[PDB]
Amino acid sequence: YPDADGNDVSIIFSGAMSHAIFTYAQSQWNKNIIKLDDYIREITLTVPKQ
Amino acid sequence: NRATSAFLDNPHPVGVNYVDEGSRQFVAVAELLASKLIDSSRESDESNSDVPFVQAYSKFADDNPRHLRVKTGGKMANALTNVIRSYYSINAPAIVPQVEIDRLASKATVSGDMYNSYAIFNSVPIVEVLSPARTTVSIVGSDRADVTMLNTGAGAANITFNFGQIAETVILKGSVPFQLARLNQPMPAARFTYKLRPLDGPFIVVLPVGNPLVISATAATRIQVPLAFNKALVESGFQTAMNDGLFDIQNVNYYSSFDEFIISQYHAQDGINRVSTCVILGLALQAYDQMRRALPV
Amino acid sequence: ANRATSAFLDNPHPVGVNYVDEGSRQFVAVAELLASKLIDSSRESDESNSDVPFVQAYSKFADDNPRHLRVKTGGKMANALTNVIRSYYSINAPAIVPQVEIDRLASKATVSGDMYNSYAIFNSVPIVEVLSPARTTVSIVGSDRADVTMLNTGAGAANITFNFGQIAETVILKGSVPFQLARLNQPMPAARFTYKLRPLDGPFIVVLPVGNPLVISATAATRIQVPLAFNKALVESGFQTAMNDGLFDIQNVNYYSSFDEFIISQYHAQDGINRVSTCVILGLALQAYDQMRRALPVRRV
Amino acid sequence: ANRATSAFLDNPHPVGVNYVDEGSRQFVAVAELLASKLIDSSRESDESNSDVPFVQAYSKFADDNPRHLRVKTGGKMANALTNVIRSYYSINAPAIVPQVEIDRLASKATVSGDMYNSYAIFNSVPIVEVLSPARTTVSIVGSDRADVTMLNTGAGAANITFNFGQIAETVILKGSVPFQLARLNQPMPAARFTYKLRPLDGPFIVVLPVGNPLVISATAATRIQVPLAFNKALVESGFQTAMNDGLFDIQNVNYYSSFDEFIISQYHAQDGINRVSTCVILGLALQAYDQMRRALPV
Amino acid sequence: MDVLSKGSLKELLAHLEKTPLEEAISYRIGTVPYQNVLISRNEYYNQLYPDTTSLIDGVSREGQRNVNGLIMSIISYVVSGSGHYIPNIGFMLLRRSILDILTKHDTGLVTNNLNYGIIARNLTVSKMNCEQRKRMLICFKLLAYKDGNQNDYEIYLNQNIPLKQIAPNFIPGDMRTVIHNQDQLAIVGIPAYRLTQSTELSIRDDNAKSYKLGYVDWYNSNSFLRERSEFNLIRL
Amino acid sequence: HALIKEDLGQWPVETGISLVNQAGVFAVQLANKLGIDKPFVLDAGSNYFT
Amino acid sequence: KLVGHNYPVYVEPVVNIMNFISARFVADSSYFGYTNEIMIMPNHINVPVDD
């Protein structure tokens, strides 16, 4: 079923440990996935003013 | 005339159940898991995903959290709440089965005991202040004792101070300099502050006729506690448990803080054995505060 | 005839009605999260003997790198946080920060912004009213522990009425000597040292005999909904820093010794439920103000 | 004229002038860092079932492996930390620890001993003097919360002078009943419950009406530069432990209830500025002493 | 942001045609203007910094429900990017665009009997810069020509010589004057090189700087966020 | 009778060697088997039947 | 250096993942096939079991 922000959520029958490890891995990689505009803002701060 | 501290009067007996090695392991396990539960909640709030909280709640409550149902805390919360009730008073029922406690204690392994550390408790015990004729003595306060004394007789009066034998050091300060010395010892010159060891014996303080003298007292007592003990958390847990009504049982005494509770039980007959149960209650209250903050009900 | 009341409960000044929406709450929560990162990065920079951890945290916080020959104060984030703290205290304080700046600053982090996740216990004891007969003198001293000293001269068995309000959850009474206390139209029990009372039970009558002054020490506990990041130690330290810096030097306002007295006094006023919501947001902002100001110390004696 | 002063402000004893150099400051900061890891090692020992995290941290702290035979004391670092604390309190205490040992202990960690990169709020109320007329009686009680009780027995009202010193940043006055306080040569304000004062402005005059006693509660806040690793809760606990352990037992010294009273009393001396720097280093050492002695009690 | 970015009379008038009156007004109570306050500027001074709150600060302030309050809110939106709090304006006026309120008779609003000297004093015309002064005079001329008060507009300009020098050169009824106008009215815009992320002393200066700094980010990341809300909706 | 079993494999543990060392070595193998060691994004929205 | 290394604030996700897996290996041992306690009993003694 669709999430509010357009993501797809899958409900399945799966293990407690396999679900815990897989979803924790997803959350760790996700916080390092950012939009291009935010990436440009971070780059602009590093480069000189002009 | 005799004046004594209010919090030291008639300490009610504490519970005699859930004090064995298995029960102590259950309290230590509960504190360890509750701390992880509150740490995951803060990490969960900061980030977008709620994965850390789900895993912590599942370990604590043995069921996955659900949006429709409220987060009660599971069987661990129910066992912890009733065990706290039993410790306070001997009249509180000991209903929680031991097989259920043993099963919960096996969730995690704790490498420690209840006697591997210590904590300083700043509750001043004034067992008695014996005063002669025409000498009014009032004792106010528990963390800081305010002994206001005033005499109307023509001659100076001697007032006996008994601080018990459990406190390590007692610090005395006065509104104006006063003379104090042990029994059968020469009086020193007037000083503003004194440092005393309560084992030294009853202390004699003189009172001039002129103006009232107020003595401010502080004390430090060391009690063996687990290394995970935290005085800030046990104070919050004590207040929360009192508000929740876990201590509403007949023929018991109510205290302002866990500091006064443990000191009053210490200053009683069979006080060494009472204190061990009180320390277990302290760690249980530490777990109760952390869990209730993450799961308010 | 005679009436006595706690000093901190008299005339609670109105709180600000600005910066209380969802976007402003997210801004305060973002500030607390990023101010915490500043403190940890300063500890890491000290241990690592390098400025790399501090530069990264300051750049995220201030959108600018630390500058040589220029005191580091926190940039626009510090300016916005300091002004909204002033606005929270009183209505007389102006509203200066625009809405565009807050929305820009609220997007730095991914905080929830919820203000009702958890609870906190406050120790200020409210004594709304103590009514005394003509020949009795009553004094109320203290906020964390209230000492009520009462003297009865002549006649006998003066009746003193205690009104602790309705907001406080539990109140514990301790006396220098055992005393008698019971509710209205109830029999007086045997004298005992301590009492546990629910302030909602009603006015409490205490029997005071002649001579021998009796002092009652009262401690109270009140529960207020607060975020999970709430830490009372940081809030109280931030409160003193704000008072020292002069952020609360506004006209026609009341000054308090601690955040405990502030939140309790506002709770006991009329429409106090909606005042507490603003006070909690002020507490989180003062938490951020404390961690930010310790990481960057401008004031030098 | 009756003059009443706070009990804790009188006769501040001289503090030690040793172990205040850069090398010694790094030693205290190293001790705080290594004692913090020692406490955390206990929790990391519980997540597993082994004692390797604790043995690993003890060896770093004590330069020797723990043994089941003897009581874990702390090694050379424990003796150095204990003796350095004694030298801080009084100038009569010997400086037993050599500087070579301190330099060796300071190289364990790479911390920098900068003690002026943060601030702390201290709540002791400094009341230097309260001057009252003949008929009035004034009593000052307490340090964290100063309860000044004044009774006027004369025919007319009395003026009482309050001097809060020149160090405290803010002082908040709350009275049992409304009262009037104005600075010298300024018109009296209407009766209010609460007054906020800046002590530097000048002495304050309080009008005492004839009748029931008036009690004023005072709370003060003072900002003192401290290291960033300062923890007031941990410092206060260490002070009580050091007092109980007898680290402060030395002739011709003054004893205080809390580190709040100690630092404020030293600050209010004739040359109190130089004492505060040493007192802050003592607090950081006391913070390390609390963490270490709790992990290793003797 | 969008209104302050327009740099020509054509663009400003086109924007006011497409913008409803809802954007001009705000639903935040704010504070009362004309108040001597002390604000915190820790970049420069340890002491608090005095200033006076105004209607052109860029922050919503309370305003009355008369005709003057609505006009003052519109002018503040043009020159500061934020309007005032006028309680319960009504759906009938909120759907109308800003230009119709200024230059049309179908709004049901009587904008006659308006004093430009009083309005200029309330908006602190002595504190606004050349571009803000120019924008204010554009609104005045549109109001004057719609109600047939061109003489009162000229009288106001004669009394204020500094405003007469920088008066706009367009006539509201003639299209040729609008297209050939060469006024520059851009308060904010993308600058060559960059501007330091530093605070300013005044309330107006700091708020204006916050608009300039955030314009670059607003320029790049506005199309998608606005489109997500615009989709599946009917315009007012 | 019936039951559901989660099978994550068998990982023998030696008592003498430290448990944390074995857990870390097994963590690398478990992450590789589950496919979470490298940065990744789940694509399971198309795994359905109507 | 390995013993005294301090984890940076921006620690890599692979380290966080491995710490999560190792923690679950120790905390929940029944999932991976080992336990801390066993019991040996004769057949004639009836033990309450999971039925």
Coordinates of N, CA and C in Angstrom, one line a residue, chain B residues 4-7 9 38 41-42 45-48 138-144 146 236 239-240 242-245 247-248 253-256 260 288-289 292-294 296-297, chain C residues 33 37 109-114 116-119 121 123 144-145 147 169-170 172 174-176 193-196 212-213 215-217 219-223 227-230:
Chain B
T4 N 13.1 15.7 68.1 CA 13.6 14.7 67.1 C 13.2 15.1 65.7
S5 N 13.9 14.6 64.7 CA 13.6 14.8 63.3 C 12.3 14.1 63.0
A6 N 11.5 14.8 62.2 CA 10.2 14.3 61.8 C 10.3 13.0 61.0
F7 N 11.2 13.0 60.0 CA 11.3 11.8 59.1 C 11.9 10.6 59.8
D9 N 10.8 9.3 62.6 CA 9.9 8.7 63.5 C 9.1 7.5 63.0
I38 N 14.7 4.0 26.7 CA 14.6 5.4 26.7 C 15.7 6.0 25.8
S41 N 14.3 5.7 22.2 CA 13.2 6.6 22.0 C 13.8 8.0 21.6
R42 N 14.8 8.4 22.2 CA 15.5 9.7 21.9 C 16.1 9.6 20.5
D45 N 13.3 9.6 18.0 CA 12.7 11.0 17.7 C 13.5 11.8 16.8
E46 N 14.9 11.7 17.0 CA 15.8 12.6 16.2 C 15.7 12.1 14.7
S47 N 15.7 10.8 14.4 CA 15.7 10.3 13.1 C 14.3 10.1 12.5
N48 N 14.2 9.8 11.2 CA 13.0 9.6 10.5 C 12.4 8.2 10.9
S138 N 13.4 24.0 68.2 CA 12.6 23.6 67.1 C 13.5 23.0 66.0
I139 N 13.1 21.9 65.4 CA 13.9 21.2 64.3 C 13.1 21.3 63.0
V140 N 13.6 22.0 62.0 CA 12.9 22.1 60.7 C 13.9 21.7 59.6
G141 N 13.4 20.8 58.7 CA 14.1 20.4 57.5 C 14.7 19.0 57.6
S142 N 14.9 18.5 56.5 CA 15.6 17.2 56.3 C 16.9 17.2 55.6
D143 N 17.0 17.9 54.5 CA 18.2 18.0 53.8 C 19.1 19.0 54.5
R144 N 18.6 20.1 55.0 CA 19.3 21.0 55.9 C 18.5 21.2 57.1
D146 N 17.4 23.0 60.5 CA 17.4 24.3 61.1 C 17.0 24.2 62.5
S236 N 13.4 10.9 40.8 CA 12.3 11.1 39.9 C 11.3 9.9 40.0
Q239 N 9.1 10.0 43.2 CA 8.0 11.0 43.1 C 6.9 10.4 42.2
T240 N 7.3 9.8 41.0 CA 6.3 9.3 40.1 C 5.5 8.1 40.7
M242 N 5.0 7.5 43.9 CA 4.1 8.1 44.9 C 2.8 8.6 44.2
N243 N 3.0 9.4 43.1 CA 1.8 10.0 42.5 C 0.9 8.9 41.9
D244 N 1.5 7.8 41.4 CA 0.8 6.7 40.8 C 0.0 5.9 41.8
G245 N 0.3 6.1 43.1 CA -0.4 5.4 44.1 C 0.1 4.0 44.5
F247 N 2.3 3.4 46.6 CA 2.6 3.4 48.0 C 1.4 3.6 48.9
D248 N 0.2 3.6 48.3 CA -1.1 3.8 49.1 C -1.5 2.5 49.7
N253 N 4.3 4.8 56.5 CA 4.8 6.1 56.6 C 5.3 6.7 55.3
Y254 N 5.0 8.0 55.0 CA 5.3 8.6 53.8 C 6.4 9.6 54.0
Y255 N 7.4 9.6 53.0 CA 8.6 10.4 53.1 C 8.6 11.4 51.9
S256 N 9.4 12.5 52.1 CA 9.4 13.5 51.1 C 10.3 13.1 49.9
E260 N 15.3 10.5 52.5 CA 14.7 10.4 53.8 C 14.3 9.0 54.1
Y288 N 11.7 2.1 36.8 CA 10.3 2.6 36.7 C 10.3 4.0 36.1
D289 N 11.2 4.9 36.5 CA 11.2 6.2 35.9 C 11.5 6.2 34.5
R292 N 8.5 4.7 32.4 CA 7.3 5.5 32.4 C 7.5 6.8 31.5
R293 N 8.7 7.3 31.5 CA 8.9 8.5 30.6 C 8.8 8.1 29.2
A294 N 9.3 7.0 28.8 CA 9.2 6.5 27.4 C 7.8 6.1 27.1
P296 N 4.4 6.8 28.7 CA 3.4 7.4 29.7 C 2.0 6.8 29.4
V297 N 1.4 6.4 30.5 CA 0.1 5.8 30.5 C -0.9 6.4 31.4
Chain C
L33 N 18.6 20.1 19.2 CA 19.4 19.0 18.6 C 20.7 19.4 18.1
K37 N 24.8 18.8 19.4 CA 26.0 18.4 18.6 C 27.2 19.3 18.8
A109 N 17.2 19.9 10.4 CA 17.1 18.6 10.9 C 15.8 18.0 10.6
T110 N 15.6 16.8 11.1 CA 14.4 16.0 10.9 C 13.7 15.6 12.2
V111 N 13.6 16.6 13.1 CA 12.9 16.4 14.4 C 11.4 16.3 14.3
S112 N 10.8 15.6 15.2 CA 9.3 15.5 15.2 C 8.6 16.8 15.6
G113 N 9.1 17.5 16.6 CA 8.5 18.7 17.1 C 7.4 18.4 18.1
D114 N 7.1 17.2 18.5 CA 6.1 16.9 19.5 C 6.4 17.4 20.9
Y116 N 4.4 16.7 23.7 CA 3.7 15.9 24.6 C 4.1 14.4 24.6
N117 N 5.3 14.1 24.3 CA 5.8 12.7 24.3 C 5.9 12.2 25.7
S118 N 6.4 13.0 26.7 CA 6.7 12.5 28.0 C 6.2 13.5 29.0
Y119 N 6.8 13.3 30.3 CA 6.3 14.1 31.4 C 7.5 14.5 32.2
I121 N 8.4 16.0 36.5 CA 8.0 16.3 37.9 C 8.6 17.6 38.4
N123 N 8.8 20.4 41.6 CA 8.8 20.4 43.0 C 8.3 21.6 43.7
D144 N 10.8 25.6 47.2 CA 11.1 24.1 47.0 C 10.6 23.4 48.3
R145 N 10.8 23.9 49.5 CA 10.2 23.4 50.7 C 9.7 24.6 51.5
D147 N 8.2 26.4 54.6 CA 8.1 26.3 56.1 C 7.1 27.3 56.6
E169 N -0.4 17.5 42.4 CA -0.9 16.1 42.5 C -0.8 15.5 43.9
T170 N 0.3 15.6 44.6 CA 0.5 15.1 46.0 C 1.3 16.1 46.7
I172 N 3.1 16.5 50.7 CA 3.5 15.9 51.9 C 3.8 16.9 53.0
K174 N 5.2 17.7 56.8 CA 6.0 17.3 58.0 C 6.0 18.4 59.0
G175 N 5.8 18.0 60.3 CA 5.8 19.0 61.4 C 6.9 18.8 62.4
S176 N 7.3 19.9 63.0 CA 8.4 19.8 64.0 C 7.9 19.0 65.2
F193 N 3.2 13.0 63.0 CA 4.2 13.9 62.5 C 3.9 14.3 61.1
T194 N 3.6 13.3 60.2 CA 3.5 13.5 58.8 C 2.1 13.2 58.2
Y195 N 1.8 13.8 57.1 CA 0.5 13.6 56.4 C 0.8 13.5 54.9
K196 N 0.0 12.7 54.3 CA 0.0 12.7 52.8 C -1.4 13.1 52.3
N212 N 4.5 27.0 72.2 CA 5.3 26.0 71.5 C 5.0 26.1 70.0
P213 N 5.7 27.0 69.3 CA 5.4 27.2 67.9 C 5.6 25.9 67.1
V215 N 6.0 24.2 63.3 CA 6.4 24.6 61.9 C 6.1 23.4 61.1
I216 N 5.4 23.6 59.9 CA 5.0 22.6 59.0 C 5.9 22.8 57.7
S217 N 6.6 21.7 57.3 CA 7.3 21.7 56.1 C 6.6 20.9 55.0
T219 N 6.2 19.7 50.9 CA 6.8 19.4 49.6 C 5.7 18.8 48.7
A220 N 5.7 19.3 47.5 CA 4.7 18.9 46.5 C 5.3 18.4 45.2
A221 N 4.5 17.7 44.5 CA 4.9 17.1 43.2 C 3.8 17.3 42.2
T222 N 4.2 17.9 41.0 CA 3.3 18.2 39.9 C 3.9 17.6 38.6
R223 N 3.0 17.1 37.8 CA 3.4 16.4 36.5 C 2.9 17.3 35.4
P227 N 8.6 17.3 26.2 CA 9.2 16.4 25.2 C 10.1 15.4 25.8
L228 N 10.6 14.5 25.0 CA 11.5 13.5 25.4 C 12.9 14.0 25.7
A229 N 13.3 15.1 24.9 CA 14.6 15.7 25.0 C 14.7 16.6 26.2
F230 N 13.6 16.8 27.0 CA 13.6 17.7 28.1 C 14.6 17.2 29.2

